[PDB]
């Protein structure tokens, strides 16, 4: 019995900032999705193009698991066809997305009383991300007609900003860990199936 290593994804010690979202390739294993869907710890579990109760009856060539941290009010952006700073500049799903979006509140682990500022998001970008594009660039963003010469200043912004998570914040400003499972269905041999 070679189960898919979901634990390595969902219980990873550290989670990426959303701008630097991580992706794991899941192949050649048996996936018991029902353990995930039946887990109450998940505040969000939304599937697209498949039904979550029937996941254990389907086979895919590959599964991808993207993971990162965002704040509560932004979880709604992790869906096809959405707009906003996360959907436009940090993590973009395709319109034809087939998969599941899973999230849970991580205030107890990602907030700290002095405020935790290690988690970052991109606040400025010259164009919207293409689907599954990943931008890790740090160049000063030129908001006006004056070039920035790589220095921050008036209309010249560092493009990444910290969330600032402290446990006292409202739910919409608390940290959420997110895992997005992408189900690849090509017409090649399947390598990830349910039991």
């Amino acid at each position, epitope marked *: 019995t070679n189960l898919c290593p979901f634990g390595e994804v969902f219980n990873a010690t550290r989670f990426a900032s959303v701008y630097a979202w991580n*992706r*794991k*390739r899941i192949s050649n294993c048996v996936a018991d999705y029902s353990v995930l869907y039946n887990s109450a710890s998940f505040s969000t579990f939304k599937c697209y193009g498949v039904s979550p109760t029937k996941l254990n009856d389907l086979c895919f*060539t590959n599964v991808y698991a993207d993971s990162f941290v965002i704040r509560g009010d932004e979880v709604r952006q992790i869906a096809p066809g959405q707009t906003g700073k996360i959907a436009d500049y940090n993590y973009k799903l395709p319109d034809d997305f087939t998969g599941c979006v899973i999230a849970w509140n991580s205030n107890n682990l990602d907030s700290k009383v002095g405020g935790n500022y290690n988690y970052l998001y991109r606040l400025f970008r*010259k164009s919207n991300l293409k689907p599954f594009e*990943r931008d*890790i660039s740090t160049e000063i963003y030129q908001a006006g007609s004056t070039p920035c010469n790589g220095v921050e200043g008036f209309n010249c912004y560092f493009p990444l900003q910290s969330y600032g998570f402290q446990p006292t914040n409202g739910v919409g400003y608390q940290p959420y860990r997110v895992v997005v499972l992408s189900f690849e269905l090509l*017409h*090649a*041999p399947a390598t990830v199936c349910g039991p």
Partner: antibody
Amino acid sequence: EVQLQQSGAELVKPGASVKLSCTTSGFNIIDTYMHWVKQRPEEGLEWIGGIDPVNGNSEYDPKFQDKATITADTSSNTAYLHLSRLTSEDTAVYYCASAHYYGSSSSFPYWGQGTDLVTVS
Amino acid sequence: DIVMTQSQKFMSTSVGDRVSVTCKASQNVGTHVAWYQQKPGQSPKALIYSASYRYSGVPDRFTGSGVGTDFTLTITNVQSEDLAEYFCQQYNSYFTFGSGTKLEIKR
């Protein structure tokens, strides 16, 4: 603009070693993998290996594992390629490149300008 | 080893026309395919990831297509600055590159 800046072309004696560098401007290498690729006119492009700058783990094509060593310094945002006991087959342009994703393999979005290594006496 | 074969060593076209570059993988690679442009004297530049996604900033006249073993890079409204060698790459198992297709412009 993002730029991977490589060190200059090198003349290397047969049997000797050389260390190439690639310094990134515009992103932090700790957010991706850094790879090295070899190019020659007739043999084409060949992946040598790549490194995970977070943990220091490097991996190589088996054809290169005994003579290539890839290292990284996150504090100076620099990746290095060490080649040992060079022969004429090591005369080539060596490129540094960064990866798109972290956690799994992906394409290489950014490439350095290349470093010509010539092996001769 | 997964071998990526580009059977076309050269292709010719005119400014404004379109051309399609072909790549065949020796094994199924799904969509773990990228395309790169290399102008003479310069390093490769990334054009396509995941077989058919274009990076931000890449002109929309570059399109990638194909799944499995057969892949195509299509260039429409060809411009003189597209003079380059075009290389496919698979990253499904390690990393291997095609042998490159050099574009020639008729004028």
